[PDB]
Design a protein around this ligand. Structure first.
Ligand SMILES: CC(C)(C)NC(=O)[C@@H]1C[C@@H]2CCCC[C@@H]2CN1C[C@@H](O)[C@H](Cc1ccccc1)NC(=O)[C@H](CC(N)=O)NC(=O)c1ccc2ccccc2n1
Ligand SMILES: CC(C)(C)NC(=O)[C@@H]1C[C@@H]2CCCC[C@@H]2CN1C[C@@H](O)[C@H](Cc1ccccc1)NC(=O)[C@H](CC(N)=O)NC(=O)c1ccc2ccccc2n1
Lengths: 99, 99
């Protein structure tokens, strides 16, 4: 699709076998999902946002299906206000900014 | 331009004689730039993101060139680690997210 930015670019994702929504975020280097369980071992990390750094669990090689397109990569879990899909996964769906 | 996301989508911006860089940020409602203090009246306000909230000064009707395109709108000024071009000015420059 071609998504205009009149409103927040939310799409349906599927992760851990569950449907959720998430924000497609060209400004985010990483993908971060609201607290949930995921398989495999995780490592503790910190990541910084506009208001300071948060603690998160980093999971590797996680499958997300983003608006019907498959992506696999690192997914952080931590206290985010909203699930965000950042550039590490947006590149695998060929997403681009056009103007 | 059709911009892929293998790296951060930074562009040159010009606000009032000052040449700066900023991140085209689909995941941001607002435009936030670390600046001296633009001309005109402002009002204080708190904006947030991952990690909590920062204090900004809100300026309306700011004229800023973004990647060679003219936009006029609200610009928030305060202590952001990275300057960001949010959706309120992305729509003015005709930016869309595509995949
Ligand atoms: C709406 C309300 C009754 C307050 N319920 C909740 O907020 C529950 C409470 C639960 C316990 C606390 C931890 C989170 C869970 C899940 N949340 C809902 C959570 O799963 C759901 C995710 C979502 C967002 C947008 C579109 C679809 C789905 N978020 C929400 O319902 C709330 C309300 C809203 N205005 O959208 N959204 C947000 O809180 C939120 C905050 C910042 C954002 C920035 C950009 C884009 C979206 C943003 N959404
Ligand atoms: C997600 C993460 C990997 C942590 N990356 C980032 O957070 C980087 C950090 C960078 C350096 C500091 C300044 C921002 C840049 C770009 N961001 C991405 C950037 O896209 C970030 C993603 C985001 C969206 C919604 C909620 C929280 C976080 N957006 C933002 O920080 C924008 C800023 C703004 N316009 O006010 N926030 C929001 O648009 C927004 C909207 C509603 C909200 C409700 C409750 C709490 C926070 C809310 N934030």
């Amino acid at each position: 699709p071609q998504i205009t930015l009149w409103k927040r670019p939310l799409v349906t994702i599927k992760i851990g076998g569950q449907l959720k929504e998430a924000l497609l975020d060209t400004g985010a280097d990483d993908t971060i999902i609201e607290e949930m369980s995921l398989p495999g071992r995780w490592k503790p990390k910190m990541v910084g946002g506009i208001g300071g750094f948060i603690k998160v669990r980093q999971y590797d090689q996680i499958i997300i299906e983003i608006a019907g397109h498959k992506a696999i990569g690192t997914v952080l879990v931590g206290p985010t206000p909203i699930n965000i899909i950042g550039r590490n996964l947006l590149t695998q769906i060929g997403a681009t900014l056009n103007f």
